[PDB]
Amino acid sequence: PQITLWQRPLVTIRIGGQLKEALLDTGADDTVLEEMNLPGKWKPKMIGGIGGFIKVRQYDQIPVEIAGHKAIGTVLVGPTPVNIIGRNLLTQIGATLNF
Amino acid sequence: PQITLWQRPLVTIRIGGQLKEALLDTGADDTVLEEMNLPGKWKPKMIGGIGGFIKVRQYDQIPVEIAGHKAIGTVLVGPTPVNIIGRNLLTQIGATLNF
Numbered sequence: 141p142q143i144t145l146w147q148r149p150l151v152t153i154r155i156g157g158q159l160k161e162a163l164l165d166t167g168a169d170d171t172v173l174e175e176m177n178l179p180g181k182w183k184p185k186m187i188g189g190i191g192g193f194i195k196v197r198q199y200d201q202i203p204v205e206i207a208g209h210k211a212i213g214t215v216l217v218g219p220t221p222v223n224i225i226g227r228n229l230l231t232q233i234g235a236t237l238n239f
Numbered sequence: 240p241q242i243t244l245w246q247r248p249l250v251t252i253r254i255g256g257q258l259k260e261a262l263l264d265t266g267a268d269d270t271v272l273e274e275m276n277l278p279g280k281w282k283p284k285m286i287g288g289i290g291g292f293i294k295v296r297q298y299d300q301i302p303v304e305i306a307g308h309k310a311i312g313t314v315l316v317g318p319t320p321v322n323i324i325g326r327n328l329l330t331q332i333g334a335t336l337n338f
Protein backbone atom coordinates (compact mmCIF):
# COMPACT_ATOMS: atom_id res chain seq x y z
CA PRO A 141 0.00 0.00 0.00
CA GLN A 142 0.78 3.65 -0.41
CA ILE A 143 0.59 5.87 2.66
CA THR A 144 0.24 9.67 2.60
CA LEU A 145 1.52 11.93 5.42
CA TRP A 146 -1.45 14.20 6.06
CA GLN A 147 -2.04 11.84 9.01
CA ARG A 148 0.29 9.90 11.33
CA PRO A 149 1.60 6.78 9.52
CA LEU A 150 -0.02 4.46 12.11
CA VAL A 151 -0.37 0.70 11.60
CA THR A 152 -1.51 -2.38 13.52
CA ILE A 153 1.22 -4.99 14.18
CA ARG A 154 0.87 -8.41 15.85
CA ILE A 155 3.58 -9.02 18.40
CA GLY A 156 2.35 -12.54 18.72
CA GLY A 157 -0.65 -13.17 20.78
CA GLN A 158 -1.22 -9.37 20.85
CA LEU A 159 -2.04 -6.56 18.46
CA LYS A 160 -0.59 -3.13 18.79
CA GLU A 161 -0.51 0.22 16.98
CA ALA A 162 3.03 1.38 15.78
CA LEU A 163 4.35 4.37 13.83
CA LEU A 164 6.24 3.60 10.63
CA ASP A 165 9.26 5.75 11.18
CA THR A 166 12.02 6.45 8.60
CA GLY A 167 13.79 8.65 11.12
CA ALA A 168 14.41 5.81 13.52
CA ASP A 169 17.33 3.46 13.18
CA ASP A 170 15.71 0.89 15.47
CA THR A 171 12.34 -0.44 16.60
CA VAL A 172 11.02 0.62 20.12
CA LEU A 173 7.85 -0.41 21.86
CA GLU A 174 6.20 0.60 25.04
CA GLU A 175 7.10 -1.42 28.08
CA MET A 176 5.74 -4.98 27.57
CA ASN A 177 6.78 -8.56 28.31
CA LEU A 178 8.29 -10.67 25.63
CA PRO A 179 9.46 -14.25 25.41
CA GLY A 180 13.24 -13.88 25.34
CA LYS A 181 16.57 -13.21 27.08
CA TRP A 182 17.53 -9.50 27.15
CA LYS A 183 20.35 -7.03 27.44
CA PRO A 184 20.24 -3.43 28.62
CA LYS A 185 21.09 -0.80 26.02
CA MET A 186 20.77 2.96 25.66
CA ILE A 187 19.15 4.90 22.72
CA GLY A 188 18.58 8.57 21.86
CA GLY A 189 15.93 10.91 20.49
CA ILE A 190 15.57 14.73 20.72
CA GLY A 191 15.45 15.09 24.46
CA GLY A 192 18.41 12.76 25.30
CA PHE A 193 19.23 9.13 26.33
CA ILE A 194 17.03 6.38 27.83
CA LYS A 195 17.75 2.86 29.02
CA VAL A 196 15.93 0.17 27.07
CA ARG A 197 16.25 -3.63 26.88
CA GLN A 198 17.04 -5.49 23.81
CA TYR A 199 15.29 -8.56 22.49
CA ASP A 200 17.01 -10.30 19.55
CA GLN A 201 15.08 -12.12 16.79
CA ILE A 202 11.32 -11.46 17.47
CA PRO A 203 8.86 -12.09 14.62
CA VAL A 204 6.64 -9.13 14.02
CA GLU A 205 3.90 -8.82 11.41
CA ILE A 206 3.52 -5.25 10.15
CA ALA A 207 0.21 -4.96 8.23
CA GLY A 208 0.36 -8.59 7.33
CA HIS A 209 4.05 -8.32 6.30
CA LYS A 210 6.50 -10.57 8.08
CA ALA A 211 9.78 -9.30 9.65
CA ILE A 212 12.14 -11.08 12.16
CA GLY A 213 14.75 -9.03 14.05
CA THR A 214 15.52 -6.85 17.12
CA VAL A 215 12.97 -5.12 19.31
CA LEU A 216 13.76 -2.53 22.00
CA VAL A 217 11.26 -1.98 24.86
CA GLY A 218 11.36 0.92 27.23
CA PRO A 219 9.88 4.37 27.91
CA THR A 220 9.09 5.59 24.45
CA PRO A 221 6.10 7.94 23.99
CA VAL A 222 4.82 6.06 20.82
CA ASN A 223 5.55 2.51 19.70
CA ILE A 224 7.77 3.00 16.60
CA ILE A 225 8.88 0.73 13.74
CA GLY A 226 12.39 1.55 12.61
CA ARG A 227 14.50 1.09 9.56
CA ASN A 228 15.68 -2.28 10.86
CA LEU A 229 12.21 -3.84 10.20
CA LEU A 230 11.07 -1.51 7.43
CA THR A 231 13.82 -2.75 5.12
CA GLN A 232 12.62 -6.40 5.77
CA ILE A 233 9.24 -5.45 4.45
CA GLY A 234 10.99 -3.38 1.60
CA ALA A 235 9.62 0.07 2.60
CA THR A 236 10.89 3.12 0.60
CA LEU A 237 10.07 6.83 0.42
CA ASN A 238 8.63 8.16 -2.82
CA PHE A 239 8.03 11.81 -3.99
CA PRO B 240 12.92 9.82 -6.33
CA GLN B 241 12.63 6.59 -4.43
CA ILE B 242 14.85 6.52 -1.24
CA THR B 243 15.63 3.04 0.19
CA LEU B 244 16.03 2.75 4.02
CA TRP B 245 19.28 0.73 4.16
CA GLN B 246 20.74 3.97 5.57
CA ARG B 247 19.27 7.04 7.30
CA PRO B 248 17.39 9.01 4.60
CA LEU B 249 19.52 12.29 4.49
CA VAL B 250 18.65 14.98 1.92
CA THR B 251 19.93 18.53 1.04
CA ILE B 252 17.46 21.41 1.61
CA ARG B 253 17.76 25.20 1.30
CA ILE B 254 16.45 27.51 4.13
CA GLY B 255 17.87 31.16 4.31
CA GLY B 256 21.08 31.15 2.12
CA GLN B 257 22.12 27.78 3.30
CA LEU B 258 22.17 24.31 1.84
CA LYS B 259 21.94 21.73 4.69
CA GLU B 260 21.57 17.97 5.27
CA ALA B 261 18.39 16.86 6.97
CA LEU B 262 16.81 13.59 7.95
CA LEU B 263 13.47 12.73 6.36
CA ASP B 264 11.29 11.61 9.30
CA THR B 265 7.82 10.18 9.01
CA GLY B 266 7.65 10.06 12.85
CA ALA B 267 8.10 13.83 13.31
CA ASP B 268 4.92 15.96 13.34
CA ASP B 269 7.08 19.13 12.90
CA THR B 270 10.33 20.30 11.16
CA VAL B 271 13.26 21.03 13.46
CA LEU B 272 16.46 22.71 12.64
CA GLU B 273 19.56 23.07 14.66
CA GLU B 274 20.32 26.50 16.06
CA MET B 275 20.49 29.15 13.31
CA ASN B 276 20.05 32.88 13.16
CA LEU B 277 16.92 33.61 11.10
CA PRO B 278 15.38 37.07 10.92
CA GLY B 279 11.72 37.27 12.00
CA LYS B 280 9.50 37.04 14.96
CA TRP B 281 9.13 33.62 16.53
CA LYS B 282 7.07 32.39 19.44
CA PRO B 283 8.64 29.96 21.91
CA LYS B 284 7.74 26.31 22.47
CA MET B 285 8.59 22.86 23.66
CA ILE B 286 8.75 19.61 21.65
CA GLY B 287 9.76 16.18 22.90
CA GLY B 288 10.47 12.63 21.82
CA ILE B 289 12.73 9.91 23.14
CA GLY B 290 14.52 11.36 26.18
CA GLY B 291 12.48 14.51 27.04
CA PHE B 292 11.61 18.00 25.77
CA ILE B 293 13.91 20.66 24.32
CA LYS B 294 13.01 24.34 24.05
CA VAL B 295 12.84 25.81 20.54
CA ARG B 296 11.75 28.88 18.55
CA GLN B 297 8.85 28.80 16.20
CA TYR B 298 9.25 30.72 12.92
CA ASP B 299 6.16 30.77 10.56
CA GLN B 300 6.06 30.74 6.73
CA ILE B 301 9.70 29.89 6.05
CA PRO B 302 10.29 28.76 2.47
CA VAL B 303 12.46 25.68 1.91
CA GLU B 304 13.34 23.42 -1.00
CA ILE B 305 13.62 19.74 -0.17
CA ALA B 306 15.83 18.39 -2.87
CA GLY B 307 14.48 20.71 -5.57
CA HIS B 308 10.83 20.87 -4.46
CA LYS B 309 9.60 24.05 -2.75
CA ALA B 310 7.66 24.08 0.46
CA ILE B 311 6.73 26.91 2.87
CA GLY B 312 5.75 26.27 6.48
CA THR B 313 6.72 26.51 10.11
CA VAL B 314 10.19 25.37 11.16
CA LEU B 315 11.38 25.03 14.81
CA VAL B 316 15.02 26.09 15.69
CA GLY B 317 16.70 24.76 18.81
CA PRO B 318 19.39 22.37 19.87
CA THR B 319 18.62 19.09 17.96
CA PRO B 320 21.48 16.63 17.37
CA VAL B 321 20.24 16.58 13.72
CA ASN B 322 18.12 18.58 11.29
CA ILE B 323 14.70 16.92 10.91
CA ILE B 324 12.06 17.30 8.17
CA GLY B 325 8.63 16.45 9.50
CA ARG B 326 5.35 15.73 7.80
CA ASN B 327 4.24 19.35 7.75
CA LEU B 328 6.70 19.80 4.87
CA LEU B 329 6.70 16.16 3.45
CA THR B 330 3.01 16.50 2.79
CA GLN B 331 3.91 19.51 0.60
CA ILE B 332 6.38 17.81 -1.74
CA GLY B 333 4.04 14.80 -2.21
CA ALA B 334 5.96 12.07 -0.30
CA THR B 335 4.49 8.67 0.49
CA LEU B 336 5.63 5.44 2.13
CA ASN B 337 5.16 2.44 -0.08
CA PHE B 338 5.45 -1.30 0.70
Ligand SMILES: CCCC[C@@H](CN[C@@H](CCCC)C(=O)N[C@@H](CCC(N)=O)C(=O)N[C@@H](CCCNC(N)=[NH2+])C(N)=O)NC(=O)[C@@H](NC(=O)[C@@H](NC(C)=O)[C@@H](C)O)[C@@H](C)CC
Nearest residue numbers: 167168169170187188189190266267268269286287288321
Ligand atom coordinates in the same frame (compact mmCIF):
# COMPACT_ATOMS: atom_id res chain seq x y z
C1 LIG C 1 17.94 13.48 16.60
C2 LIG C 1 16.50 12.95 16.50
C3 LIG C 1 16.41 12.03 15.30
C4 LIG C 1 14.98 11.78 14.83
C5 LIG C 1 14.06 10.84 15.53
C6 LIG C 1 12.64 10.72 14.97
N1 LIG C 1 11.88 10.30 16.10
C7 LIG C 1 10.54 10.84 16.25
C8 LIG C 1 9.69 9.73 16.84
C9 LIG C 1 8.24 9.58 17.15
C10 LIG C 1 7.80 10.01 18.54
C11 LIG C 1 8.65 9.43 19.64
C12 LIG C 1 10.50 12.09 17.11
O1 LIG C 1 11.20 12.56 18.01
N2 LIG C 1 9.48 12.83 16.79
C13 LIG C 1 9.20 14.15 17.47
C14 LIG C 1 10.22 15.06 16.97
C15 LIG C 1 10.61 16.47 16.93
C16 LIG C 1 9.23 17.11 16.87
N3 LIG C 1 8.75 17.01 18.10
O2 LIG C 1 8.73 17.51 15.87
C17 LIG C 1 7.69 14.21 17.36
O3 LIG C 1 6.88 14.03 16.41
N4 LIG C 1 7.26 14.33 18.62
C18 LIG C 1 5.79 14.45 18.91
C19 LIG C 1 5.69 13.97 20.37
C20 LIG C 1 5.72 12.49 20.56
C21 LIG C 1 4.50 11.87 19.93
N5 LIG C 1 4.46 11.51 18.53
C22 LIG C 1 3.93 12.01 17.42
N6 LIG C 1 3.07 13.05 17.55
N7 LIG C 1 4.18 11.56 16.15
C23 LIG C 1 5.47 15.92 18.64
N8 LIG C 1 4.58 16.38 17.96
O4 LIG C 1 6.14 16.87 19.16
N9 LIG C 1 14.58 9.43 15.77
C24 LIG C 1 14.44 8.84 16.94
O5 LIG C 1 13.84 9.54 17.78
C25 LIG C 1 15.07 7.49 16.96
N10 LIG C 1 16.47 7.71 17.47
C26 LIG C 1 17.47 7.34 16.68
O6 LIG C 1 17.23 6.90 15.53
C27 LIG C 1 18.85 7.49 17.29
N11 LIG C 1 19.46 6.16 17.17
C28 LIG C 1 20.01 5.51 18.17
C29 LIG C 1 20.71 4.29 17.72
O7 LIG C 1 19.84 5.88 19.32
C30 LIG C 1 20.01 8.32 16.65
C31 LIG C 1 19.68 9.56 15.79
O8 LIG C 1 20.95 8.59 17.76
C32 LIG C 1 14.81 6.06 17.59
C33 LIG C 1 15.53 4.80 16.88
C34 LIG C 1 15.34 5.88 19.00
C35 LIG C 1 15.93 4.44 19.27
